[PDB]
Design a protein around this ligand. Sequence first.
Ligand SMILES: O=c1cc(-c2ccc(O)c(O)c2)oc2cc(O)cc(O)c12
Ligand SMILES: [Zn+2]
Lengths: 162, 47
Amino acid sequence: GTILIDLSPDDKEFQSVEEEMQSTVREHRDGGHAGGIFNRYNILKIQKVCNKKLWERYTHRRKEVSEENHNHANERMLFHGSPFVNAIIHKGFDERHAYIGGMFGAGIYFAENSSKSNQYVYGIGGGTGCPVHKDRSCYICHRQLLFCRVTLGKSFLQFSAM
Amino acid sequence: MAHSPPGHHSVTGRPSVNGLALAEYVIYRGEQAYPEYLITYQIMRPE
Ligand SMILES: O=c1cc(-c2ccc(O)c(O)c2)oc2cc(O)cc(O)c12
Ligand SMILES: [Zn+2]
């Protein structure tokens, strides 16, 4: 079902997506242990993910949530990093993309800081890092994350000592 | 997979100690997210 369309670096859409990635890097309290040591990225490619079935599934749930929350889907764009990005783009998010041991329960996690999602690209806590060099701070290997459309509806506010 | 607290659709994890960390969010249904952009990248070694 899925087709991937390359965006041109001269297109304003590419440029706005890169700006979201780059502007939401921060330092992490682990010193870079999980995700590596960096202040910015080299963006190599940005692809638009197109799948009519998955889209209609999303927008059907979106309208349900809107109607339960004073006509406000509370839709955001957020980052998701994991080793399963290739399954997500063909089959969608599901229970097998849940962080069963996460702070807020077994669910699917997203971040406003692109650098937070980067800590999960090679696994929980960065796993053992890249496949080729076993290096969580690899400057060579190509990484992938998703910039996702996410419906929050009425969101329970949980203040977190983090 | 867990469920949202009753009467809610998601959880917002708002960091209270580090005032530069932005929010994290959890959903409990896969159909509440669409993977719109696939970004391929390298992290860069600082100078
Ligand atoms: O992108 C995130 C991805 C994941 C994640 C964690 C465990 C998994 O088995 C998985 O498939 C994904 O966990 C997070 C946990 C966070 O607190 C913030 C995040 O952005 C993520
Ligand atoms: Zn590597």
